Amino acid sequence: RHSMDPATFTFNFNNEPWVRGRHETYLCYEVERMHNDTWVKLAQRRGFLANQAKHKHGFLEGRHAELCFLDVIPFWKLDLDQDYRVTCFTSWSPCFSCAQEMAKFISKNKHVSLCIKTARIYDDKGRAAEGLRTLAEAGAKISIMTYSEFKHCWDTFVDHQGAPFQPWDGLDEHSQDLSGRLRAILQNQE
DNA sequence: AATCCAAA
Ligand SMILES: [Zn+2]
């Protein structure tokens, strides 16, 4: 569908750091082009997707959300001599292998600046932290989603049918706690 | 310290 189901958004983007039950990953994406040295939104280069679940018929191995996203890029036919900024709002941050693949992509495509804004930090059984450091070293700008970013995703990706964004309890404090943890990760204190 | 991360 054109827009994301609102219950799906609210469940998957909740940012309580240690909450259980989120065994899918959702990713909303938007692209801007640098023109007259301003970032200008490419209206048709935006959307959302989820991971292909493990054991789903026709894709029994599954495919993580970040890989489905990278798959859609060549079909955009981005112009080789223009600078782009690609922003991904992710419900879980990249696992180690996804982080390595996104780092490979940005290493091969230097005209693309990747920003990852995540609701929660995916631990990947202790392996994700090194992957996030590797992705940052390759040039990605990784941050924790804040209130205004959740509201932007509600307003522009969700099938809200006119309902306003309703923040869940503790949103801001969760964002700020996760931001401290991400800072510790990226500077190798964790 | 560990939480948390499809699989019961
Ligand atoms: Zn992954």
Q: Measured between alpha carbons, how far is A122 from A118 in angstroms, rounded to an integer?
A: 9
* Deposited experimental method: X-ray
User: Which stretch of DSSP H or E encloses residue A40?
Assistant: strand A38-50
Two tokens at A11?
A: 């469940």
What is the CA(A17)–ligand 1 centre distance, in A?
18
Which DSSP letter does residue A21 get?
-
Cβ count within 10 A of residue A92: 25
CA A135 to the chain's CA centroid: 13
Q: Measured between alpha carbons, how far is A170 from A93 in angstroms, rounded to an integer?
A: 20
- Strands in A38-50's sheet, in edge-to-edge order, are A38-50, A26-35, A84-92, A112-120, A141-144
Q: Which residue has the tokens 């005209």?
A: A111
Burial of residue A145, with CB atoms counted within 10 A of its CB: 0-12 exposed, 13-18 middle, 19 or more buried: buried
| CB hemisphere CA count around A96 (13 angstroms) | 8
User: Which stretch of DSSP H or E encloses residue A116?
Assistant: strand A112-120
Q: What are phi and psi of A143, to 5 degrees?
A: -150, 170
Q: Measured between alpha carbons, how far is A148 from A80 in angstroms, rounded to an integer?
A: 32
Residue type, A90: T
Which DSSP letter does residue A18 get?
T
Per-residue DSSP letters for A123-181?
-GGGTHHHHHHHHHHTT-EEEE--HHHHHHHHHHHB--TTPPP-PPTTHHHHHHHHHHH
Secondary structure of chain A: what % helix, strand, coil (to 5)? 40, 25, 35
Catalytic residue (choose from A61, A66, A137, A149): A66
Q: Measured between alpha carbons, how far is A13 from A119 in angstroms, rounded to an integer?
A: 6
Strand partners, A120: A92
Nearest CA-CA partner of A119 in A1, A6, A17, A7? A17
| Minimum CA–C1' distance nucleotide for A53 | B6
Q: Measured between alpha carbons, how far is A146 from A151 in angstroms, rounded to an integer?
A: 9
CA A70 to the chain's CA centroid: 12
Instruction: Respond yes or no: is residue A66 known to be catalytic.
Output: yes
Length of chain A: 190
Resolution in angstroms, to 1 decimal, for this deposition?
1.5
Nearest CA-CA partner of A65 in A87, A30, A93? A93
**Which residues, 6+ apart, have CB-to-CB distance to A159 below 8 Å?**
A1, A2, A3, A4, A5, A6
Taking the CA atoms of chain A, what radius of gyration do you get in angstroms? 16
Nucleotides of B under 7 A from a protein CB: 3-7
Nearest CA-CA partner of A92 in A116, A49, A127, A121? A121
Two tokens at A177?
A: 């706690």
**Which residues, 6+ apart, have CB-to-CB distance to A99 below 8 Å?**
A128, A131, A132, A134, A135
Q: Residue closest to B6, CA→C1'?
A: A23
Q: Which residue has the tokens 């690609």?
A: A86
Q: Measured between alpha carbons, how far is A133 from A41 in angstroms, rounded to an integer?
A: 28
